[PDB]
Design an enzyme around this catalytic site. Structure first.
Site, PDB file in Angstrom:
ATOM      1  CE1 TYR A  71      -3.926  -2.017   0.405  1.00 58.78           C
ATOM      2  CE2 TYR A  71      -2.559  -3.464   1.845  1.00 58.78           C
ATOM      3  CZ  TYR A  71      -3.725  -3.158   0.909  1.00 58.78           C
ATOM      4  OH  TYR A  71      -4.591  -4.447   0.666  1.00 58.78           O
ATOM      5  CB  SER A  72       0.706   4.184  -2.056  1.00 58.03           C
ATOM      6  OG  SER A  72       0.610   3.761  -3.216  1.00 58.03           O
ATOM      7  CB  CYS A 253       0.104   6.829  -8.372  1.00 55.59           C
ATOM      8  SG  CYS A 253       0.051   5.435  -7.211  1.00 55.59           S
ATOM      9  CD  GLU A 293       3.055   2.955  -6.124  1.00 58.14           C
ATOM     10  OE1 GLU A 293       4.281   3.414  -5.852  1.00 58.14           O
ATOM     11  OE2 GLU A 293       2.063   2.765  -5.361  1.00 58.14           O
ATOM     12  CE1 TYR A 295      -3.720   0.460  -6.737  1.00 54.13           C
ATOM     13  CE2 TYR A 295      -1.436   1.718  -6.733  1.00 54.13           C
ATOM     14  CZ  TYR A 295      -3.014   1.483  -6.488  1.00 54.13           C
ATOM     15  OH  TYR A 295      -3.535   2.834  -5.593  1.00 54.13           O
TER      16      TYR A 295
HETATM   17  C1  FAD Z   1       2.978  -0.490  -5.110  1.00 58.97           C
HETATM   18  C2  FAD Z   1       1.397  -0.548  -4.888  1.00 58.97           C
HETATM   19  C3  FAD Z   1       0.792   0.207  -4.079  1.00 58.97           C
HETATM   20  C4  FAD Z   1      -0.622  -0.066  -3.753  1.00 58.97           C
HETATM   21  N1  FAD Z   1      -1.122   1.051  -2.941  1.00 58.97           N
HETATM   22  C5  FAD Z   1      -2.380   0.911  -2.762  1.00 58.97           C
HETATM   23  C6  FAD Z   1      -3.051   1.870  -2.011  1.00 58.97           C
HETATM   24  O1  FAD Z   1      -2.503   3.060  -1.757  1.00 58.97           O
HETATM   25  N2  FAD Z   1      -4.731   1.707  -1.847  1.00 58.97           N
HETATM   26  C7  FAD Z   1      -5.215   0.488  -2.162  1.00 58.97           C
HETATM   27  O2  FAD Z   1      -6.428   0.392  -1.807  1.00 58.97           O
HETATM   28  N3  FAD Z   1      -4.550  -0.236  -2.730  1.00 58.97           N
HETATM   29  C8  FAD Z   1      -3.134  -0.308  -3.184  1.00 58.97           C
HETATM   30  N4  FAD Z   1      -2.569  -1.123  -4.062  1.00 58.97           N
HETATM   31  C9  FAD Z   1      -3.347  -2.634  -4.449  1.00 58.97           C
HETATM   32  C10 FAD Z   1      -3.178  -3.517  -3.090  1.00 58.97           C
HETATM   33  O3  FAD Z   1      -1.787  -3.947  -2.883  1.00 58.97           O
HETATM   34  C11 FAD Z   1      -4.044  -4.664  -2.942  1.00 58.97           C
HETATM   35  O4  FAD Z   1      -3.833  -5.273  -4.259  1.00 58.97           O
HETATM   36  C12 FAD Z   1      -5.397  -4.616  -3.046  1.00 58.97           C
HETATM   37  O5  FAD Z   1      -5.794  -4.010  -1.742  1.00 58.97           O
HETATM   38  C13 FAD Z   1      -6.437  -5.641  -2.927  1.00 58.97           C
HETATM   39  O6  FAD Z   1      -5.916  -6.739  -2.089  1.00 58.97           O
HETATM   40  P1  FAD Z   1      -6.759  -7.562  -1.323  1.00 58.97           P
HETATM   41  O7  FAD Z   1      -6.002  -8.465  -0.488  1.00 58.97           O
HETATM   42  O8  FAD Z   1      -7.863  -6.674  -0.787  1.00 58.97           O
HETATM   43  O9  FAD Z   1      -7.287  -8.579  -2.583  1.00 58.97           O
HETATM   44  P2  FAD Z   1      -7.218 -10.318  -3.143  1.00 58.97           P
HETATM   45  O10 FAD Z   1      -7.915 -10.917  -1.817  1.00 58.97           O
HETATM   46  O11 FAD Z   1      -5.668 -10.777  -3.298  1.00 58.97           O
HETATM   47  O12 FAD Z   1      -7.828 -10.041  -4.324  1.00 58.97           O
HETATM   48  C14 FAD Z   1      -7.362  -9.742  -5.523  1.00 58.97           C
HETATM   49  C15 FAD Z   1      -7.198 -10.703  -6.412  1.00 58.97           C
HETATM   50  O13 FAD Z   1      -8.637 -11.091  -7.083  1.00 58.97           O
HETATM   51  C16 FAD Z   1      -8.543 -10.712  -8.426  1.00 58.97           C
HETATM   52  N5  FAD Z   1      -9.363  -9.549  -8.546  1.00 58.97           N
HETATM   53  C17 FAD Z   1      -9.352  -8.172  -8.149  1.00 58.97           C
HETATM   54  N6  FAD Z   1     -10.017  -7.275  -8.793  1.00 58.97           N
HETATM   55  C18 FAD Z   1     -10.916  -8.025  -9.700  1.00 58.97           C
HETATM   56  C19 FAD Z   1     -12.187  -7.834 -10.801  1.00 58.97           C
HETATM   57  N7  FAD Z   1     -12.511  -6.609 -10.916  1.00 58.97           N
HETATM   58  N8  FAD Z   1     -12.410  -8.786 -11.418  1.00 58.97           N
HETATM   59  C20 FAD Z   1     -11.999 -10.183 -11.310  1.00 58.97           C
HETATM   60  N9  FAD Z   1     -11.081 -10.376 -10.355  1.00 58.97           N
HETATM   61  C21 FAD Z   1     -10.534  -9.528  -9.755  1.00 58.97           C
HETATM   62  C22 FAD Z   1      -7.273 -10.998  -8.782  1.00 58.97           C
HETATM   63  O14 FAD Z   1      -6.904 -12.552  -8.961  1.00 58.97           O
HETATM   64  C23 FAD Z   1      -6.633 -10.422  -7.733  1.00 58.97           C
HETATM   65  O15 FAD Z   1      -5.064 -10.700  -7.589  1.00 58.97           O
HETATM   66  C24 FAD Z   1      -1.385  -1.185  -4.181  1.00 58.97           C
HETATM   67  C25 FAD Z   1      -0.427  -2.058  -5.004  1.00 58.97           C
HETATM   68  C26 FAD Z   1       0.717  -2.093  -5.257  1.00 58.97           C
HETATM   69  C27 FAD Z   1       1.328  -3.032  -6.022  1.00 58.97           C
END
Ligand code: FAD
Length: 295
Positions: A71-72, A253, A293, A295
């Site tokens: 998370y940023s 971003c 950046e 994602y």
């Molecule tokens: C450098 C970086 C910075 C980030 N900064 C932020 C930030 O500031 N704020 C923020 O909220 N997030 C940020 N993110 C994204 C964050 O890391 C997580 O990916 C996001 O919060 C979702 O994680 P989760 O555990 O909630 O989801 P998971 O439980 O892992 O669900 C995600 C998975 O489900 C699937 N999926 C997701 N969306 C869909 C869709 N529309 N349709 C179908 N399948 C889908 C994919 O397989 C994905 O891998 C950032 C990511 C990176 C890489």
């Protein structure tokens, strides 16, 4: 000088949630929370534009421990209270389809974070990232192209530049360049940090420009919903003219998919002066002045 990986996932920092506050107002789409963590007891230091990892509890569908999500960082190095004691995140609850009636899927780490209570202990790793760093040069120009939670690194830049307490805390950085945020969200309720961004623009009308692309309230010239790539197209000549300055840095971003439109708009602007933008941009990346950046 840049702090990196002061904590790693094999031995993360255990911080406590201080606060968890909503950023989407009533009438907005989705849930985005501002979450502040207590860093006292450890030595996690960071700067603007970096990220941290959060390790959510539990196991995945295969019974394996959940891995970190990045998370940023949404606060400056000093934290929101300018006390060097905290760190903040800007977290959207991931939720989506899987095509059944009412059957919504909720992301593991983001649902955990958006619903977390003050007092809860959290596994934190990092900080990480050297691709979204702000120049020390007070005269730099800073173009910020953000959608949704991509606002987060932009907030760390703008707070360091323009918050009274930050300016008092950072004698060495008294920003006098020009910064321009183009910010894309679906609704006016969804404008994260709206009041503070607008207060900054009112205080610093010559050093900060704020441009919104609000898809459900605005249409581009072709009749479609207004997105950030439409605003970049609308201002493509001005943006290109700023980008030609040796001291201009651009930051992009948010969720993936924005860059193609931004490139097409800038490519048309640059081509008017016999410049192929993709080549100019390659040199800008090499120079550390094109920061992305998504994602
Ligand atoms: C450098 C970086 C910075 C980030 N900064 C932020 C930030 O500031 N704020 C923020 O909220 N997030 C940020 N993110 C994204 C964050 O890391 C997580 O990916 C996001 O919060 C979702 O994680 P989760 O555990 O909630 O989801 P998971 O439980 O892992 O669900 C995600 C998975 O489900 C699937 N999926 C997701 N969306 C869909 C869709 N529309 N349709 C179908 N399948 C889908 C994919 O397989 C994905 O891998 C950032 C990511 C990176 C890489």
């Amino acid at each position: 000088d840049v702090p990196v990986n002061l904590y790693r996932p094999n031995a993360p920092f255990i911080g406590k949630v201080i606060s968890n506050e909503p950023l989407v107002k009533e009438g907005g789409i989705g849930i985005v929370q501002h979450i502040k963590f207590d860093l006292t007891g450890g030595n996690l230091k960071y700067i603007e534009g970096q990220s941290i990892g959060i390790i959510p509890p539990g196991v995945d569908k295969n019974g394996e421990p959940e891995k970190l999500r990045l998370y940023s960082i949404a606060s400056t190095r000093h934290g929101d209270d300018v006390d060097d004691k905290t760190i903040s995140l800007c977290v959207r609850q991931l939720e989506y389809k899987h095509p059944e009636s009412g059957e919504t899927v909720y992301g593991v780490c983001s649902t955990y974070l958006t619903h977390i209570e003050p007092g809860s202990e959290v596994k934190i790793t990092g900080p990480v990232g050297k691709e979204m760093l702000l120049p020390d040069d007070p005269e730099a120009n800073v173009i910020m192209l953000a959608t949704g939670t991509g606002i987060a690194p932009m907030r760390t830049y703008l707070w360091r530049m323009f918050k009274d307490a930050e300016r008092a805390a950072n004698p060495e950085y008294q920003f006098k360049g020009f910064s321009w945020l183009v910010f894309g969200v679906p609704t006016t309720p969804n404008i994260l940090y709206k009041e503070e961004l607008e207060e900054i623009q009112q205080k610093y009308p010559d050093n900060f420009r704020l441009t919104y692309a609000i898809s459900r309230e605005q249409k581009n010239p072709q009749g479609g919903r207004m997105y950030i790539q439409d605003r970049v197209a609308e201002h493509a000549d001005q943006l290109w003219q700023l980008i030609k300055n040796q001291k201009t840095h651009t930051y992009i971003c948010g969720l993936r998919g924005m860059e193609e439109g931004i490139d097409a708009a800038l490519s048309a602007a640059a081509a008017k002066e016999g410049v192929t933008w993709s080549d100019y941009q390659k040199d800008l990346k090499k120079a550390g002045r094109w920061h992305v950046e998504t994602y």
